[PDB]
Design a binder for this molecule. Structure first.
Ligand code: HEM
Ligand SMILES: CC1(C)[C@@H]2CC[C@@]1(C)C(=O)C2
Ligand SMILES: [K+]
Length: 405
């Protein structure tokens, strides 16, 4: 449906892009979003889809808006409006100044020091999942690796049972790529229904898991409330269950389709960290945004207090004004410009865990299964939303070309 055009929005800026079902989706989701960067499309457009909102289409504007939290508030960061209003996760639903104190606590559970306590288990799980698949000569990559690898690591970190994954993954996905059966508010309250008692049990009897550490944490020297803990833990679950999970499939689809790039990383494994960064640029996948706190003229466009603006993190690095030949993957690219992990005060806190999971996957997969392809006659379908993904990724290989370590 197309919402009525607000009185302050001129017709010439109207471009009815649907972030949950973009028209060019069959080309690939990044390609579908990149239609917003065709030469005739303004830097800032209005879509009547999903209740009506602005979209900044160029890295310059996306970066500026993410830096200016005084005009572009995180209080209502999701489209549609109902979802942004219900959205209350911490720290993401807060602006500075109050946001900042919560970042340190989140860093205690997903930050670089914690990656250190997990490196060996991350390594061991990647290797065991890949070795189990290796002799089969085929897999459904989304279900067989992309999901279980990051999700089981998160569930370990959080001290949550693996048999809870199907329920939690379903709920998480309703917040980013809703199937229509639940509103954001319903999904969020179901997630909170799961968490609240676990949080109370771990405040009564603390363990060493991430939920215990958040629930018994301090924020700038005072105790976190049960409610704040819940709102932080919800966000951590969503990051654990619906970010890397999707990104790995874009990356593995690319490698399945580009033997040259596989060989590069096999021959020059020192390049894997750089490859991770270039893949994070090319297969960027997040798009949230902000709400206007006041009327504001931005790049010659009149914005009105309460207007939502989508600021797609995905688009900055695909912008030819940020990177030449942006749809080309070049592992030797000298300045890999992107906002894949966000920009401004809300920079991703999970990014070190994400990079470790990506780099481990690339190294351990190519060590064992250097030669693989998309299954015969398969046409890979993507899906779009707050976080975009790959619906299915059937891969095949000849087991004779693989190596058990
Ligand atoms: C490829 C993987 C990932 C990508 C692309 C990604 C992307 C992002 C983006 C774009 C933001 C900023 C959102 C905004 O400004 O509104 C963000 C924030 C955040 N992410 Fe990540 N993320 C990833 C992985 C993770 C993981 C694995 C976790 C935790 C398990 C995580 C936890 C967080 C947290 C806690 C924030 C909030 C920071 C704040 O609001 O101050 N992320 N992420
Ligand atoms: C936009 C995000 C990727 C970031 C971490 C999880 C996510 C869906 C959020 O709600 C904040
Ligand atoms: K809100």
């Amino acid at each position: 449906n197309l919402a009525p055009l607000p009185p302050h929005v001129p017709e010439h800026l109207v471009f009815d892009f649907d972030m949950y079902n973009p028209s060019n989706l069959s080309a690939g989701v990044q390609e579908a979003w990149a239609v917003l960067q065709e030469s005739n499309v303004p830097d800032l457009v209005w879509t009547r889809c999903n209740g009506g909102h602005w979209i900044a289409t160029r890295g310059q504007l996306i970066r500026e808006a993410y830096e200016d939290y005084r005009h572009f508030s995180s209080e209502c960061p999701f489209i549609p409006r109902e979802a942004g209003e219900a959205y209350d996760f911490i720290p993401t639903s807060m602006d500075p100044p109050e946001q900042r104190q919560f970042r340190a606590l989140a860093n205690q559970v997903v930050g670089m020091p914690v990656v250190d306590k997990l490196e060996n288990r991350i390594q061991e799980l990647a290797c065991s999942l890949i070795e189990s698949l290796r002799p089969q000569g085929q897999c459904n990559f989304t279900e067989d690796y992309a999901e279980p690898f990051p999700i089981r690591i998160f569930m370990l970190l959080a001290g949550l049972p693996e048999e809870d994954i199907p329920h939690l993954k379903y709920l998480t996905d309703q917040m980013t790529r809703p199937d229509g059966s639940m509103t954001f508010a319903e999904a969020k309250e179901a997630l909170y229904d799961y968490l609240i008692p676990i949080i109370e049990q771990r405040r009564q009897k603390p363990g060493t898991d991430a939920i215990s550490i958040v629930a018994n944490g301090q924020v700038n020297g005072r105790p976190i409330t049960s409610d704040e803990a819940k709102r932080m833990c919800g966000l951590l679950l969503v990051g654990g269950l619906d970010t890397v999970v999707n990104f790995l499939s874009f990356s593995m689809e690319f490698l399945a389709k580009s033997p040259e790039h596989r060989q590069e990383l096999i021959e020059r494994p020192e390049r894997i960290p750089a490859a991770c960064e270039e893949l994070l640029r090319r297969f960027s996948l997040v798009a949230d945004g902000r709400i206007l706190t006041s009327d504001y003229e931005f790049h010659g466009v009149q914005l009105k207090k309460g207007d939502q603006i989508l600021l797609p993190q995905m688009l900055s690095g695909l912008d030819e004004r940020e990177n030449a030949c942006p749809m080309h993957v070049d592992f030797s690219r000298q300045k890999v410009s992107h906002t894949t992990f966000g920009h401004g005060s809300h920079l991703c806190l999970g990014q070190h865990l994400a990079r470790r999971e990506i780099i481990v996957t690339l190294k351990e997969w190519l060590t064992r299964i250097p030669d693989f392809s998309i299954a015969p006659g398969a046409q890979i379908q993507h899906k779009s939303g707050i976080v975009s993904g790959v619906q299915a990724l059937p891969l095949v290989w000849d087991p004779a070309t693989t190596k058990a370590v």
